[PDB]
């Protein structure tokens, strides 16, 4: 029933601005105090802003320094957060939350909306097949991979045979090399089934709206 759905996140340059929204369903939105809480890339949680049922009382967190503005429209069951003069340390996941009673625990949370503040620009990935080659294996199982390099921003989603190959998959967290992310994914299959039966990795980058398939084929030596 109770639903908290957030929107408005994205990538912005330092100094810029962005307005986040949080639509509500399932309860009497006007009866409840609401807040925004943010989680930094370091998984640090900070109380960014608070607003009472009526919108008459407001609080902001310590490092906010005048650059945030929280508001609400109890006629459209929507909570807002306007951010100004953004800094890199304002990069975080931003959550819309609801308060329970006057000790101020937070009994419902939204799904989150991601805010990234940097001068970097959106870049599609490169996708390279990882076949064994000069390092051929010789047991009952064989491990293959795909290398995903040079994309911005996160995230990417990796699948194998369009999701059919799900067991035996390890997709590792991306790492930032020079404002560009790099990631690898491995899959293990029976030695008897490759290349007898094809293996393809599927890479999707939503931000650049790119889709690419890479078949894993034995090399020419």
């Amino acid at each position: 029933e109770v639903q908290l759905v957030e929107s408005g996140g994205g990538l912005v340059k330092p100094g810029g601005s962005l307005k986040l929204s949080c639509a509500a369903s399932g309860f009497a939105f006007g009866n409840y105090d609401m807040s925004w809480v943010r989680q930094t890339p370091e998984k640090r949680l900070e109380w960014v802003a608070f607003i009472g049922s009526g919108g008459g009382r407001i609080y902001y967190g310590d490092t906010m320094k005048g650059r945030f503005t929280i508001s609400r429209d109890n006629a459209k069951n929507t909570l807002y957060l306007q951010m100004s003069s953004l800094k890199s340390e304002d990069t975080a996941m931003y959550y819309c939350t609801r308060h329970y009673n006057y000790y101020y625990s937070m009994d419902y949370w939204g799904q989150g909306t991601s805010v990234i503040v940097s001068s970097a620009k959106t870049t599609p990935p490169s996708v390279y097949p990882l076949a064994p080659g000069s390092a051929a294996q010789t047991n009952s199982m064989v491990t293959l991979g795909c290398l995903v390099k040079g994309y911005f921003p996160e995230p990417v989603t990796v699948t194998w045979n369009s999701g059919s190959l799900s067991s035996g998959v390890h997709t590792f967290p991306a790492v930032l090399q020079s404002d560009l992310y790099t990631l690898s994914s491995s899959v293990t299959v029976p030695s008897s089934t490759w290349p007898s039966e094809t293996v393809t990795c599927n890479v999707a980058h939503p931000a650049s709206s790119t889709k690419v398939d890479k078949k894993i084929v034995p090399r020419d030596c």
Partner: protein, 211 residues
């Protein structure tokens, strides 16, 4: 101001054990709350008002404390309890930094494999050598790279996965990035894993001038 710290930062236990984690305050405050988070999803209300369980919380969980010290306790821990737990209270700007509870299991050596740079990455002037270390335990593990008989530790990046949902193992990638010229200038590439399942390392290698 009034600020919170948590201890321990990381801990692991077998299912069936008692578990306790502590949250302390620089001065006296009351009505402490506790939130549960698992990777990829939002924090979730778990305990509130120092001792009240939120809905859907097993009775194995309990919260207590007063003044400057509070704790969260779990009897007969279950695998599903594994998560990060954060404390917070109505007068605090920054949440406590969290206790991450992980699952203890039987030791296991990694499955290791190494991959030379792909032909198409070479065509673009770059050369990544990739080494996977899959399904080991505990998380602590050492990887060494040797090029042509010499040890190398410059262009290496290491990345671990979260503890696995199904079997509680860890996997990691270890990537050595070079340009094409430096790759073309050496022949033997070795990836070496020293774990505590093994006084003797696990070794995987290739020669560039083959294939």
């Amino acid at each position: 101001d009034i600020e919170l710290t948590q201890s321990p930062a990381v801990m692991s236990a077998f299912p069936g054990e008692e578990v306790t984690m502590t949250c302390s305050a620089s001065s006296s405050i009351n009505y402490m709350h506790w939130y549960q988070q698992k990777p990829g999803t939002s924090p979730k209300r778990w305990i509130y008002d120092t001792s009240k369980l939120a809905s859907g919380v097993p009775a194995r969980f309990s919260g207590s404390g007063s003044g400057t010290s509070y704790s969260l306790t779990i009897s007969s821990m279950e695998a599903e309890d594994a998560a990060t737990y954060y404390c917070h209270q109505r007068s605090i700007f920054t949440f406590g930094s969290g206790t991450k509870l992980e699952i203890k299991r039987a030791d296991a050596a990694p499955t290791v494999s190494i991959f030379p740079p792909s032909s198409e990455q070479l065509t673009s002037g770059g050369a990544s050598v990739v080494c996977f270390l899959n399904n080991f335990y505990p998380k602590d593990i050492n990887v060494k790279w040797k090029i042509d008989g010499s040890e190398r530790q410059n262009g290496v990046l290491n990345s671990w996965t979260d503890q696995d949902s199904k079997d509680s193992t860890y996997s990691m990638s270890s990537t050595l990035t070079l340009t094409k010229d430096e790759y073309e200038r050496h022949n033997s590439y070795t990836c070496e894993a020293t774990h505590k399942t093994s006084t003797s390392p696990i070794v995987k290698s290739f020669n560039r001038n083959e294939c």
